[PDB]
Design a protein around this ligand. Structure first.
Ligand SMILES: Nc1ncnc2c1ncn2[C@@H]1O[C@H](COP(=O)(O)OP(=O)(O)OP(=O)(O)O)[C@@H](O)[C@H]1O
Ligand SMILES: [Mg+2]
Length: 845
């Protein structure tokens, strides 16, 4: 099998020589790479480098340039001056073959890399800031930054990589070819992709290499022995990196790679055994929701097409999970054939295509196809299925005619929430359908690796009158409760909507003006609910428009089309909807059109276009709040969406998938996803988490209490003590009255450590309603208690709670700015102590 993500790996042993300075780490890095087959050469210039490339490409392609021809190949294809990192990257991954016309007029195909036979490519290393650069056919595709042992790797990542887009001179030109960065202090080694567009991911996207059980490989020697094994490295560079329709480069994380290669080997081995068309031919990957199932599964599909014996590879997704970006991606492969309709024509067309393998479609369309068409030639062909998270509504019938009509097949599935006998619900189980579990990356592991955010979950109890309904467990009483007499009661909706309007900005980190921040979804129970909330938001927002011309409204959109508490599949056919809803939808689409200057109508085509454009605008924050029923709750990917407002009954897999809309990692600003619920989901939340996990999993997944973060607590998984906000406040007032107290070195560093804690803690506490109330109390009184009474009604606080809140002592507003200016004055001096990490992202706001 030759897997590059190891099942077992025996930890290496230190040479006893000094491992402290960058010189040490570099010495042994070069030594190790050299032992693993990387030739150390000396390149002191862009010219020496170019000459080396000439040798390697000539060697590789079996050809010889003259100086003229070579100058031309350099100026046009290889080192073209107009090209940036993006262009170089497209040349590495998409078009690596230059069709070159020699001076004698013949055509040769000049390869940058041999992707069929990987080990033919020449790998070698040069050195420098301490850096070791890994050259593939002379081209610098990898770079290793080395810092000393006591250096905080995050600050070192802050340093370059966000400090900013450092120019590219004429002599460093070839280094625009860099695909992959690896940074290490020897204790910890993290790798990550080179950013093309001028965006530049945060530290949260960096990752340690790992084994198939997802246990980390942290230290440079072991990282080297594994990731930098030439076979491993080249595979990461060539096969397990992705360059997509957004022109963004992504390196796959270890778990994604392991799952993928295990799928591929499963296909190969089952084929040579003639073991096709059985559950033992395929498998399922259990990758926790939001860990990249879609990236990975489609990458596996594209890779499974590279098997000589496979005629067709189906990549099928649930039309429910389609969004603007993912549709854009699939357009390049199966044009106009991936959407929310039932039509099979596009599928039939892609199916008959000379020189093609990949067939991207929806489980709906696949189902309809296999229903209606029994004579297809693809049926007797050698076929692979990759099912990305379409396990339910149309899946049963789909599987039925699958096993019926497909004679030679290997079928696989990805899910974050598997089907177990417990939650079976009429559907065959995941294990039953796909057979063995080939790999897993489970939520606790994902949280541990910080590749998925945790949740903060609270039932908002402001509503004594409606609380009986909001806590109701019986299934039949909830169905009956949809009406203006109970759940859709005007006062309930008014009060809730008022809450969302009041606390939107606080939740989304939009509070501080001159800060970008996040946005939200509201997920509701029914079409009428959506209709009511959209109605009520518009009214309440036009009311406060009169109260003030300093009132800045939120942009609100909605989308719904004709539907336990599981999530119902909505059709994309808006002809099914009753006249009331279609009237309301049309109106909102008209408002939407006039606002965004779009032309969308409500016929299925116009609605589909509405769906696409909506997704893009919610993703980029042109929409502040998306009110929804069953849409964009399962596969929608929006790293800037941090808060989900919930008036709905969500259970089990539906629960997780809905909440997981906020689970995407972004930077130190977005600490966890915010879930705010106007029905009580506590027991359902815990049920759901425990379903995929154990009794303890909920302690990892759910964020801690307000009191804990104020007074401190002890993290169970780490074992570490996380000091509370008031102990930080206390220690700031005590140890650093300031600015006089700044002075000596140690008293500076200690202040940076402490104020780091401060900024993190306060940022975390923004999301707590208690803390919002506490901070809002800091303006208020002296004279007219019109605001004092206004403060009580808005934050739902009585005279009892109000009494002690006076006593809680926070630092003066001026003192926070003294602290902040001091923090900057230190960090800047530092740019002109290895232990420390400044919070730049938290600072910037
Ligand atoms: N290796 C990677 N490097 C950088 N970013 C990644 C990587 N893998 C995934 N992501 C990002 O994480 C986000 C979520 O990925 P994706 O939607 O593919 O996950 P998912 O498991 O399908 O989520 P869901 O369970 O909600 O459908 C995407 O924006 C994706 O770009
Ligand atoms: Mg997905």
């Amino acid at each position: 099998n030759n897997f590059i993500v190891l099942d077992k790996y025996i930890k290496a042993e230190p040479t006893g020589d000094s491992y402290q300075s960058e010189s040490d780490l570099e010495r042994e890095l070069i030594q190790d790479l050299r032992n693993q087959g990387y030739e150390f050469i000396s390149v002191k210039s862009q010219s020496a480098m170019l000459a080396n490339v000439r040798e390697q490409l000539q060697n590789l392609n079996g050809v010889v340039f003259n100086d003229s021809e070579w100058r031309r190949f350099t100026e046009q294809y290889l080192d073209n001056p107009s090209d940036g990192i993006l262009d170089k990257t497209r040349k590495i991954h998409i078009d690596y073959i230059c069709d070159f016309i020699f001076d004698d007029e013949r055509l040769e195909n000049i390869y940058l890399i041999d992707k069929k036979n990987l080990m033919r490519n020449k790998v070698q290393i040069i050195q420098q800031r301490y850096d070791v650069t890994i050259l593939v056919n002379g081209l610098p595709l990898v770079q290793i930054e080395l810092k000393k042992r006591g250096v905080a790797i995050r600050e070192a990542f802050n340093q370059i990589h966000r400090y900013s887009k450092e120019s590219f001179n004429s002599e460093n030109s070839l280094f625009k070819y860099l695909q992959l960065f690896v940074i290490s202090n020897g204790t910890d080694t993290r790798y990550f992709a080179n950013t093309t567009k001028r965006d530049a991911n945060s530290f949260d996207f960096t990752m340690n290499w790992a084994k198939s059980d997802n246990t980390l490989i942290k230290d440079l020697k072991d990282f080297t022995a594994t990731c930098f094994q030439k076979h491993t490295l080249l595979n990461v560079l060539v096969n397990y990196s992705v360059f997509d329709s957004s022109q963004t480069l992504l390196v796959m994380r270890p778990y994604q790679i392991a799952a993928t290669e295990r799928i591929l080997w499963k296909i190969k081995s089952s084929f040579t055994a003639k073991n096709w068309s059985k559950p033992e031919s395929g498998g399922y990957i259990w990758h926790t929701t939001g860990s990249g199932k879609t990236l990975t599964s489609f990458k596996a599909a594209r890779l499974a097409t590279e098997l000589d014996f496979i005629d067709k590879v189906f990549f099928v997704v649930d039309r429910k999970d389609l969004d603007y970006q993912t549709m854009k991606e699939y357009q390049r492969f199966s044009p106009d054939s991936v959407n929310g309709s039932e039509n099979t024509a596009g599928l039939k067309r892609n199916l008959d295509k000379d020189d093609n393998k990949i067939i991207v479609t929806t489980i709906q369309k696949l189902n309809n196809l296999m229903k209606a068409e029994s004579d297809l030639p693809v049926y007797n062909q050698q076929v692979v299925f990759i099912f990305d998270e379409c396990h339910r509504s149309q899946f049963g019938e789909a599987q039925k005619n699958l096993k019926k009509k497909f004679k030679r097949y290997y079928q696989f599935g990805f899910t974050g929430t598997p089907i177990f006998p417990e939650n079976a619900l009429g559907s065959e189980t995941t294990a039953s359908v796909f057979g063995r579990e080939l790999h897993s990356y489970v939520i606790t592991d994902a949280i541990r690796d910080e590749k998925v955010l945790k949740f903060k979950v609270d039932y908002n109890d402001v509503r004594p009158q409606f609380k009986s309904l909001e806590t109701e467990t019986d299934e039949k009483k909830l169905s009956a409760a949809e009406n203006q007499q109970a759940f859709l009661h005007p006062m309930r909706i008014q009060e809730i909507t008022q809450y969302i309007l009041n606390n939107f900005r606080q939740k989304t980190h939009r509070t501080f003006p001159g800060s970008k921040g996040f946005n939200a979804m509201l997920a509701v129970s029914s079409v009428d609910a959506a209709k009511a909330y959209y109605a009520t938001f518009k009214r309440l927002q036009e009311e406060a428009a009169n109260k003030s011309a300093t009132y800045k409204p939120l942009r609100i959109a909605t989308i719904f089309s004709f539907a336990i508490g599981e999530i119902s599949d909505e059709t994309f056919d808006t002809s099914a909807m009753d006249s009331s809803a279609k009237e309301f939808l049309d109106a909102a689409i008209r408002e939407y059109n006039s606002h965004f200057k779009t032309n969308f109508s409500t016929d299925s085509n116009g609605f589909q276009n509405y769906y696409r454009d909506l997704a893009q605008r919610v993703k980029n924050q042109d929409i502040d709040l998306l009110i929804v029923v069953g849409m964009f709750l399962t596969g929608f990917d929006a790293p800037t969406l941090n808060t989900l407002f919930v008036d709905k009954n969500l259970r089990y897999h539906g629960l997780m998938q809905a909440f997981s809309r906020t689970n995407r990692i972004y930077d130190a600003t977005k600490t966890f996803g915010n879930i705010v619920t106007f029905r009580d989901l506590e027991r359902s939340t815990i049920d759901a988490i425990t379903l995929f996990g154990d009794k303890n999993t909920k302690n990892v997944v759910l964020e801690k209490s307000y009191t804990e973060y104020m007074e401190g607590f002890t993290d169970a998984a780490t074992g570490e003590a996380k000091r509370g906000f008031m102990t930080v406040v206390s220690e700031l007032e005590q140890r650093f009255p300031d600015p006089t107290s700044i002075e000596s070195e140690k008293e500076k560093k200690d202040f940076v450590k402490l104020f780091g804690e401060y900024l993190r803690a306060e940022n975390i506490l923004q999301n707590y309603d208690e803390f919002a109330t506490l901070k809002a109390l800091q303006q208020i009184d002296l004279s007219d208690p019109v605001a004092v009474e206004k403060f009580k009604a808005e934050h739902y606080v009585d005279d009892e709670k109000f009494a002690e809140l006076q006593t809680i002592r926070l630092p003066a507003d001026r003192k926070i700015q003294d602290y902040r200016s001091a923090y900057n004055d230190i960090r800047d001096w530092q740019r002109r102590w290895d232990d420390v990490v400044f919070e730049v992202d938290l600072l910037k706001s």
